[PDB]
Amino acid sequence: KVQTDPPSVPICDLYPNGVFPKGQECEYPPTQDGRTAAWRTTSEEKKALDQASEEIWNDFREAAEAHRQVRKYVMSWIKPGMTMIEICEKLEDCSRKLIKENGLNAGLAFPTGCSLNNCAAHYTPNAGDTTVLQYDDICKIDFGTHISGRIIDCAFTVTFNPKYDTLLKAVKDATNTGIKCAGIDVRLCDVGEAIQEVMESYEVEIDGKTYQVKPIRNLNGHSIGQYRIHAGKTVPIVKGEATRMEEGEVYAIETFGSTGKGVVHDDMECSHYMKNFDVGHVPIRLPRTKHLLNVINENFGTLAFCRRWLDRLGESKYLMALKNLCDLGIVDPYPPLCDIKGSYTAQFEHTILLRPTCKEVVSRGDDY
Numbered sequence: 001k002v003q004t005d006p007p008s009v010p011i012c013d014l015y016p017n018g019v020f021p022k023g024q025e026c027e028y029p030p031t032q033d034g035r036t037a038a039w040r041t042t043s044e045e046k047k048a049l050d051q052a053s054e055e056i057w058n059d060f061r062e063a064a065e066a067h068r069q070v071r072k073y074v075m076s077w078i079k080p081g082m083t084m085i086e087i088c089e090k091l092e093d094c095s096r097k098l099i100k101e102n103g104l105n106a107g108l109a110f111p112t113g114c115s116l117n118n119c120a121a122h123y124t125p126n127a128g129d130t131t132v133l134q135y136d137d138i139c140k141i142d143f144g145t146h147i148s149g150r151i152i153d154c155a156f157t158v159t160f161n162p163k164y165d166t167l168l169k170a171v172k173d174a175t176n177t178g179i180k181c182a183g184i185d186v187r188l189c190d191v192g193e194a195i196q197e198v199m200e201s202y203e204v205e206i207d208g209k210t211y212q213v214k215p216i217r218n219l220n221g222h223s224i225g226q227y228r229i230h231a232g233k234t235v236p237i238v239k240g241e242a243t244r245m246e247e248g249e250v251y252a253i254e255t256f257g258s259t260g261k262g263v264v265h266d267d268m269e270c271s272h273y274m275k276n277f278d279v280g281h282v283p284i285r286l287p288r289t290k291h292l293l294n295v296i297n298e299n300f301g302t303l304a305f306c307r308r309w310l311d312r313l314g315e316s317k318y319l320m321a322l323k324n325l326c327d328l329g330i331v332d333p334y335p336p337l338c339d340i341k342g343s344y345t346a347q348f349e350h351t352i353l354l355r356p357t358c359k360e361v362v363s364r365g366d367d368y
């Protein structure tokens with residue numbers, strides 16, 4: 001069994017044995033003593049510990065492979081002229097097929113971000129959005145797959161005008177630097193500072209104007225828990241918190257470079273929502289509010305969703321119910337995050353596994 005073109009064969013059918021390809025495996029960075037972390041590779045207790053979680057790592061790997069094949073398909077057809085809705089639906093169709101969506105056991109981990117230009121994150125079109133991708137646009141494609149709530153959060157930036165090449169390069173390098181600086185026992189602030197240093201070593205010229213690339217100070221990498229995109233620990237992308245990464249944790253390492261102020265504010269119409277992982281059970285009598293929470297619980301649990309995904313489930317006239325869920329604090333809204341009008345923002349993101357034996361850039365590909 002080989003993959004089709006366009007991709008339509010689920011990843012689990014491509015590996016009948018249930019063993020999925022590993023990401024990039026790295027040795028952890030040396031400690032402040034200068035001492036190597038190579039011992040972890042050959043340790044008996046670490047090899048045992050790592051094997052105990054093989055099913056889990058293997059789940060991430062399935063999700064990551066879907067992600068690789070999905071984004072490769074996307075890069076081949078994404079073109080200005082297409083509506084943002086058309087882009088998202090086409091990516092998502094492919095993603096459903098390859099992840100072999102199965103309710104909460106396998107599916108899409110969060111909505112397809114395609115934030116444009118000054119907007120950096122959390123934009124996906126709601127129904128009726130007639131936005132079209134433009135030749136001069138800079139588009140952040142950020143989408144997620146999961147298997148059993150093992151989430152791949154992974155993103156790259158799409159352009160068509162070579163004028164942004166260096167901006168994209170700055171951010172790619174910054175993201176790779178964070179990935180490199182990350183490891184067990186590493187201070188989150190140190191990763192932040194390292195990321196900043198690389199990002200800011202780049203200058204770019206866009207339409208006769210120059211800028212030093214700035215990290216977006218109020219955006220960050222994050223710990224990943226099960227069915228939980230942000231698990232509590234944040235990774236600064238500026239010089240931050242001295243809390244340390246720990247063995248067995250999973251991280252989204254993401255950076256954002258901007259030609260703007262290097263700060264985002266909530267802007268535009270909201271599309272992204274997600275249940276508060278900490279909210280307990282709440283009885284609701286209000287019929288449409290109760291119905292919508294039920295739909296959310298059955299379909300997304302604690303995974304993020306968007307309004308388009310409610311439309312496709314056949315829900316309508318739900319806006320008030322959704323607002324109610326937000327106001328009650330059962331659901332949280334995640335509106336698009338934008339730097340100043342006229343700025344350009346870029347993003348690259350990988351998920352990494354802090355395995356006892358090594359660091360695995362599980363979502364790494366030939367592409368980035």
Ligand SMILES: Cc1cnccc1-c1cc(C(F)(F)F)cc2[nH]ncc12
Nearest residue numbers: 110122153229230272273274304334
């Ligand atoms: C939950 C959260 C908390 N603090 C910062 C970011 C996010 C987040 C939210 C979503 C969203 F919008 F889908 F809920 C997707 C994300 N990808 N990476 C981080 C992330």
Ligand SMILES: [Mn+2]
Nearest residue numbers: 142153154155
């Ligand atoms: Mn992401």
Ligand SMILES: [Mn+2]
Nearest residue numbers: 153252254349
């Ligand atoms: Mn993320």
